[PDB]
Structures are given as C-alpha cells and as structure tokens.
Symmetry: none
Subunit: 230 residues, 4 copies
C-alpha cells in the first residue's frame, strides 16, 4: 500500500498500475524487478552506469566498473564488450576471465563463480570481539538481511582485526530462487561502504553484542568453477 521497492533503491516505482497497483522498473536496465529479494548484480551495475549523456582523454582507473549486457534472467552475459571492439568473457560475478579480444570473441558458457572470500578489516578496539558472537551475528546478517540460505555461508574466521566470510555455492546446489552468493556479496559491499541498496532500511549498523563494528578495509576474491585463461 506504498509504492516503494525495499530490496532495490535503484528503481522507479509509481502507482500507475491498474487500480493503483505499484508499478516499478529497474533504473538503467529497464528490467522488471522483484522487490522481495536481491536484484542481480548485473542489473545493479546497469543502474550505476546509467550514462545519461565535458570530456577528456587520458589513462583511467574505474574500479572495474562498466555498463554490462544482462540476459533476460538478469545475470551477466558470458561475452561482455564495453568499448566497440574490445570484448571478453566474464563469470557470474561479471569480472573479466580472459584476455580482452576482438568482436569475433567466442564465449560459450557463463562460468559460475562458486566461492567468494570477503576479507574485512575492522577499526581495532581495546577488547576484541567474542568469536562466537561475531560469527553468530554475521550469519544472521546474511540470512536475514540478504536472504541467503545458511547452507551457503561456508565459514566465518576471526583473528585480530581482519574478519573473513567464506561463501560457497556450486551450481549443483543452487535451486529455484535461491539468492546468489554473487548478489549477497554485492549487497554486503555496498552496505559496508555506506551505499546500501535498500529503500527504507538504509544503513548497515553492524554492531556485535551492542559494540559497533566499523569496517576500514574490504577485499573480495571470486573463485570460479573453472580457472581463468590469461
């Protein structure tokens, strides 16, 4: 009864559907969105890279960001070109998994990313956190906030400052509508850097047993079912 899209703020909803039914479409892609679970990373990248329309010419760092082509199911397309003739292949996370080729390039399958290492560093505290609670609370987080099944958070390590979350999802084990670790990860990263994609609960508090857990560095490593070809 309120034309909002909680799970994806990168969208335009307006109650112009039959009877006031809230219609809501993805920003940049134009695709339909499901405001009950996570939106695919590919369509969220399409939003980031809207590209409405002064110039320069240089060398450039972009953080690996670009406007991808996403299939009807909203995942990445195996082949991915951004400039005119530079093309390559990507994994389910849409990172480059080959040497940039030419417009003839042949990518034959979307190689699944099945393991993701999230290494977080946290603002050191006088008293480090209880491993038990830190684990318990990170597992809750992925379960409740990112709607990821507990069976896909493989492990949660904890030493002084650096924290690590391992995610495992083979293709053999992802069923209908299971949220992808690819996307759970991305929602986490956005949250961590304070750009939460959630339209209404915006903000990652992330406090363990009351004490807040500020994160200072974040690195994410994608392991694919097939090793890249460089």
């Amino acid at each position: 009864d309120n034309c909002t899209c909680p799970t994806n703020k990168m969208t335009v909803c307006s109650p112009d559907g039959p009877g006031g039914r809230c219609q809501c479409r993805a920003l940049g892609s134009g695709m339909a969105v499901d405001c009950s679970t996570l939106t695919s990373k590919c369509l969220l990248l399409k939003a980031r890279m809207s590209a409405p329309k002064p110039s320069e010419h240089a060398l450039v760092d972009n953080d690996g960001l670009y406007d991808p082509d996403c299939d009807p199911e909203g995942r990445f397309k195996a082949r991915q070109c951004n400039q005119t003739s530079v093309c390559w292949c990507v994994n389910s996370v849409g990172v480059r998994r080959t040497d940039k080729g030419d417009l003839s390039l042949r990518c034959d399958e979307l190689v699944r990313t099945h393991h993701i290492l999230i290494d977080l560093r946290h603002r050191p505290t006088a008293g480090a956190f209880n491993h038990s609670d830190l684990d318990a609370e990170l597992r809750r987080l992925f379960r409740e906030r990112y709607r990821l099944h507990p069976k896909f958070v493989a492990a949660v390590h904890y030493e002084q400052p650096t924290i690590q979350i391992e995610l495992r999802q083979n293709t053999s084990q992802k069923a209908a509508g299971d949220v992808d670790i690819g996307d759970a990860a991305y929602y986490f990263e956005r949250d961590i850097k304070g750009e939460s994609l959630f339209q209404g609960r915006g903000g990652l508090d992330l406090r363990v047993r009351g004490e807040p857990l500020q994160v200072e560095r974040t690195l994410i490593y994608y392991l694919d079912e097939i090793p890249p070809k460089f």
Copy 2:
C-alpha cells in the same frame, strides 16, 4: 486482488511482492511492463519468439527451418523498450531499423554504425474484408475505425490522419511526427501492432482473442492485411 496485465497478455505476474504486491514482467524480454497502457512493439516481438526456458519434451526449430515472414525476428530493446537502432541476429550480420523495427538499410557486418533510430511517422494499414452482398457506408466505417484506435488502442484521435473506403479494400492512415508526441502518447507503431495482432486473431489483450469489428451491427471479417511504414528519413538501399 488479482494479478492481471490486461494490456499485455504476454507477461508473467504473481502476488510475490512486498506485502503481496503484484509483480509482473514481460515474457521473454524479462523487462518491466506498464499494465495500464500498450507495451512497446519491441518488448512484444521479444515475447513472441521467446525460446521456452527448458523445452523438456519439446523440439527446437531447425537451424535451416524458415518461417512465412522473413521480417519476424527476436529484437534487442533499449531500456525505454523501443527498438535499438542496430539489430544483429545472425553471427556476423547486422542492420539498422526504424522505430517500428523493420529494416532500413543493407545488411552488414559487426562494424556497422546506426547513428539514430529513424522515426516511422506515417503508417498505412490496407485491409480487405470477405465480401458481403454489398458494401457499407464509408461514414459508419470511418466512425468505427476511428472509435477503435480511440478507445481500444488508446491512440489520441488526432493521430488517425484519414480513413478511406471503396469496394471491399479498406485503408487507415496514421500520422505521428516526433514533434507531436507528448508525454506518454502511445506511439502509432504500437497502436498499429496491437491492431494487426488483433486483425489476425493473436490479440494481446487479456480478455480478447481477436477483433470483433462490427460496423452498424454487420460483422467485418478481414481476409488480407498490408501495413506500409513511411520513415522521416528514406531507407538507404
């Protein structure tokens, strides 16, 4: 209440959104759809061919099989839902299209550049109806055809240039420059598509299957159909 997309049957809805909210998406395209007005031709062409996901007793049309309509094809649509100016389907064959999606140029290679999406501004729909003992009154035809675009196809009555009528063969002119298209005016390309799809009994409306098309009580059954598209820029062949 009930998940319907009454302006585009070629969709998939369900009450699976926030607090039961009816979500609904475009078959094949996977794109978002406005269930309160017409859907862009492109989003509907994508839905037509549509490659069912797991065929699973089914068979796929052969590499060498061919259909009655050369021009039929699975297009690529931009985020606004209109045809991308350039349309490659074959491995290394590209072309440019107009706003209505038909081919404007000689087929090409993957280096091709289509600079703008040339606008189709005039459309000519050339129906022929299975004869009755006589003809009808042109008056009643113009009235009815203009009423259909006006109510059913939600096309502002200013964009029906003319209706012509002779022994049997009927004609409907549509005119819409890009200057005269306001916010959310339905396109004539879209209205025309909906019309033909209905004329040929693959209606895209929820409750309907075809076009009734009765004039002053007498039903009007349509044997032939021809739809000529005129572009602002003439096609380079």
Copy 3:
C-alpha cells in the same frame, strides 16, 4: 445437395452446368477445385491476393515505403495447383520457393532459374494456449489433435510425426517426404494452412466455419502460433 464447396469457401458455385449441374470455380485463380479435399495453399493465397482494380479513392502507399505483408503475396501456381518453383512479384524481382511457398534463395532478377520445386517435408507447428488453472491430460490432447487433422483436414495419420505437450506451448510435428506421398494424399503444407486459418478464426470451410477445438470438453484457445518449415534441401542464402 446445394451448390456448396465445403472444403473451400473461397469459390463461386452455381448450378449453371449441364442439366443444372453444380459448377464451382476458385476465386482469384480461376482454377478448378476439388470440393471433397483441401485446396492447394497456392490457390488459396491467390484467392486472398485478388487485388481488385480501378482503385478510385484509395491511396497508393508510397514510393519510399517499407512493407509488412506477413510474407503473403500473390503466387503463380502450376496447372496442378502447386507453387511454381520460380516466383516474381511486382515486377522484375524474383526468387525460388519451396512446396509451401516461402522464399528459399536470395532475391534475384528476371534471369533467375529455379531448378526444381524443393519439397517441404517437415512442418513444426508451435502453438501457445491461454493458460488455464492447470494443464490438460496429454493423452486427451494428443488424441484430439490427431483426430482433428485426420477427420477435419483429411490428412493421413501416418504423417503426424509427433504431438508434444508441456505447460502452455503445444507442438505438432508433421513429416511428409516426396518418397512417401501417394496419389491424392493431401499435403502437410496444405493441412497446415487450413489449420492456421482455422486457428486464427478465418476458417476456410464453407459450412462448418468453426474450430471448436475442445479437449475433454474444456476449450483450447490459442494465443500464439509459429509454423516452421524444413525443406528436403537447405536454403541458399
């Protein structure tokens, strides 16, 4: 009975023959017609494509217009009623067709030579029907589509290769090589056409005129129909 051609409505019958005999000629072709079985597609296309003359009020579409003719055209038909292997419309542009009449070669000039009438031996009819609450009993469906082509379109059961079924989309495979078609075996390409025309509500039968198309009582309404044509020799493009 009465001067009626039950298998082809696109005709004029009158009892102007010897001793009030019923003579009946085919509209647009002028060809004879066998009112006991299906007429050839080529002759039915000719009927649809009359294109009457003298065009008083009607507008001539454009010099610079693109055509959406659904592949339809006025074909030339050999004295037996099959498609001429060489087809040229509107003048001076030609191509070769197959037994079903679709283009099989790149368009050509008035020197083009079409060796033979390459046969269409496999027809895939992909249907899609109005989703019900559930599905139908596959058995009953396959039984009723087999019965339909057998009784209605007078096609021999041995030519309906398969009948597949899933959620909504329904497929019907027909296979008739040249090596296996006898004298007065109705063609698959013709039964196909008769099917499509009935599917899209423009029945060709003079006196039934209705595809009830119900399976175990529940009616089967068809939302989308694609027909794929596989030739005994691949096309040359």
Copy 4:
C-alpha cells in the same frame, strides 16, 4: 599523549619509543609515515594488500581468485614513498607505471627496464551524485570542493585546475607539473587517491569513515566515480 596517526589509519603506532615516544609505521610496508600530511599512494596500496603475517586460522585467496579491479596490486615503493617506475607482480611479468600507479605500457618480461617515473600532471575526477529534486548552484559547489581539497587533503589551491558541474555530474580537474611541485607540497596523485577513498567509504582518516560533502547544508552522496590520469609523456601501447 595519545598514539594516533590521523592522516593515515592504515598504520600501527605504540608508545614504545625513547621516553614513551609514539612510534608509528605503515601497514604492509613497514615504512615511516608522516602523520601530519598525506601518505603516498604507493604506501597505501601496499597496506591494502597487507596479507597479515600469520593467518593462523585465516585462509589466503587462491592463486586463481580474481577481484573487481584488475588494476589493484601490491606495488614496490622507492625509499621516498612514490612508486617504483617498474612494477612486476607475477613470477615473470613486469611493466612500467606513472606517478599514480597505473600500467602505462605493454606487459613485458624480467629484462624489461623503465628509464624514468613518468609524472601524472593532470587528473580528471568525474563524480555522479544521487539525484535530488533539482540541481545545486555551481558557485557553492566549487566554493567547497576547493575548500575541501585545501584543508582536509592539504593540497595547495593553485593545483585545483577547475570545478565543473553538469546534469548530475561534477568534473574536478587537478594540475601539478614537476616544475610547480615544491618540497612538502602534497602530490595531486596522493590527494586524488585520498579523495576517492573518502568518496567510496574507505576513508583513510582516523576519525572519519567516509566523506560528508555538504554543499550549503544538503549532503552530497555519490553513486559513481571515474578518475582519468594524464601523463606528461603519452602511453606507449
């Protein structure tokens, strides 16, 4: 009084020095750090890649894992803190880099030499901010992005070439030639880097976690960032 390195949080202090003297050192490099001005970019990359000494429950990213950013790496930094003009990471893969860190030549082998540290004299900072009902006033924005670089990133005014503003977009240009960079003048490369890290929520300053960016009171959040580096010598690809 309190062991704190406000200008670089990626370090380790302690009062283990002469008479309790606070001693502090950059993570991952073990280099000395000026806790009053910016630390060099090279020294920061080094600390991003720290790989803590013994994991000892932790795991190490595989030899095959990749990251989002192909140009993140662990650089070698000269004893002054700037990048070594030649960088290998792989077993047998070396290239050359600019004053800011990015590969400016083809990827060579272990007998590849690089014969100067090619300066980066002009940087383009492109930012897109999250939409608001309307724009800002270009007089306020420039008044602040110049005040921000001035005080926080401790960069001398005369090096902010320009501040632009288009539809959401904010161009910031930075110029610093070798001939204008005096001693203890913070490099632009190291102000540009500190900026992005704040823009993108990995701020390097002790107190802060991100960048507040309130122009006249309205907070400026930033969905997209693009940074373009121009080198005095053009890159030999």
